């Protein structure tokens, strides 16, 4: 049984979100400023600048692309709370009306990536993967967590949407509430 030991501050950030999309009824403002792709490209670029071994950087880029594609394919299935699903559907409608097939990675913020990571242990232990492969995955995502916690106040700052602007979250109207929750 594998275990992933997230730093405490990111657990607090996750619980803070878990309240925000629950009984305060806010949602994630989209398209956010720092999507998933910018995060991971910055991570990989910064880590390849210091790493000298070839296989290290090969496994680095493999991890990057793999996390990317799996987020891309799983976001719709199991990363969204109940209240958000309506915004998701509306985004699909807009994309299909504009004839651009939807990519989750170029709209959604990093908080969903933290949601993914927080899930990841169950995702892996529900499978038949190799012990060494799952172990290297845990070590890898752990290094990603470390690099993320070094910059935690660049993405996850608080701004109180009800007063100034451009906070990471926004409020919903009563019609959006009614449709999304009480369809």
């Amino acid at each position: 049984k594998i275990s992933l030991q997230i730093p405490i501050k990111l657990k607090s950030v996750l619980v803070d979100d878990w309240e925000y999309v629950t009984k305060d009824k806010k949602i994630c403002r989209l398209p956010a400023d720092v999507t998933v792709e910018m995060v991971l490209n910055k991570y990989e670029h910064e880590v390849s600048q210091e790493l000298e071994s070839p296989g290290s950087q090969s496994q680095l880029s493999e991890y990057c692309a793999g996390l990317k594609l799996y987020f891309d394919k799983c976001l719709g299935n199991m990363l969204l709370y109940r209240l958000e699903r309506l915004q998701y559907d509306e985004l699909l409608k807009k994309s299909s009306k504009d004839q651009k097939p939807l990519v989750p990675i170029r709209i959604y913020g990093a908080i969903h990536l933290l949601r993914l990571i927080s899930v990841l242990p169950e995702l892996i232990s529900s499978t038949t993967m190799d012990l060494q492969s799952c172990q290297l995955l845990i070590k890898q995502t752990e290094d990603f967590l470390v690099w993320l916690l070094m910059h935690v106040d660049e993405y996850f700052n608080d701004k109180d949407p009800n007063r100034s602007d451009d906070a990471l979250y926004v409020n919903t109207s009563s019609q959006y509430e009614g449709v999304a929750l009480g369809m």
């Binding site: 009563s174 019609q175 009614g178 449709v179 009480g182």
Partner: protein, 385 residues
Amino acid sequence: VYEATPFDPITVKPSDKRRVAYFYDADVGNYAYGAGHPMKPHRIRMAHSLIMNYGLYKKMEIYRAKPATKQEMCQFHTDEYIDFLSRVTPDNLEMFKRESVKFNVGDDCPVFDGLYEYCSISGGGSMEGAARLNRGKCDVAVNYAGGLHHAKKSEASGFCYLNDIVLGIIELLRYHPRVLYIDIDVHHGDGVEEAFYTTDRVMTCSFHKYGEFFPGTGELRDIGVGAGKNYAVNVPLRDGIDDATYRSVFEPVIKKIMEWYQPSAVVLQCGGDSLSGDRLGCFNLSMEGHANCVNYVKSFGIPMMVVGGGGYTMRNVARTWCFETGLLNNVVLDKDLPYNEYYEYYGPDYKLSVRPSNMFNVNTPEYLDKVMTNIFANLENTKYA
């Protein structure tokens, strides 16, 4: 600041004379919210009945306002909301299981019949009244059919669908600079307070009940944002208030506003669910304690509109509105009811009076002093007109 002053009887002001206008459509009494509903359009008939048996038709001119059309109603609501109202009927409700949940029109305020027609009549009445005032043939317009102040911009909450008070205030604002909206229904008039929260040309002042009671809004600290800071006066009262305490709170706040805001047109929402014995309300007011406030507003002599409102027991509200109209026409009405078609409801005494109960008064004077102190301290800054 509040100081206990007893109940002085209401009397007609001698000099203030004015040529009023009574709007009544002969059909609105037929509608009826299906089965057991606290507000119903039968009590719009009973009122008129009495005014036609007391013979006030010689004292003022009664019209019927040509109804509002979709474009005119959509000065406030969104196209989709107005349209969905104009389309829905209980046969094809199932076709609308997305909108009927978005717009809240299926649960507390059901769809019954003539819905669009009823709402259109109330809206057209309100607008034509503001217009005749605006143009100036009269100096008052009573519209006892309108007054749906909970209906928000894109959802009908609280048994009321079309928010005609907002349309009336807009048509008023077409000519008059500043308009003052005085609400004395027991609930909080969140529709109008919201729809003029970010402006300085309309000042809303609502005396409502606070606590776990519909609609849970209307604290004392909601005092308007944007350019409209300090231009909204919510007064949260407590249960069981009597006529004396209500008058002693009402009079100074309204005098202070009209000293400092200086409105050019008043819109008074004369609801009847603040009366003793209602299914919904929890106050303990009489007929005199409720006519006193309208008498006070009239005293100043500003072009004004009186609008209807709640009403959960047709006997109290019918007699109250007959009395209020009589008072507006500088006539104190005889306390014995003549013979009319609905003579049977008014038992057992068959009189024009409403009786208070012995419910326990809770509004402690120190509470009132603190509230009126906060409100005066805020209003200190509306001195510039």
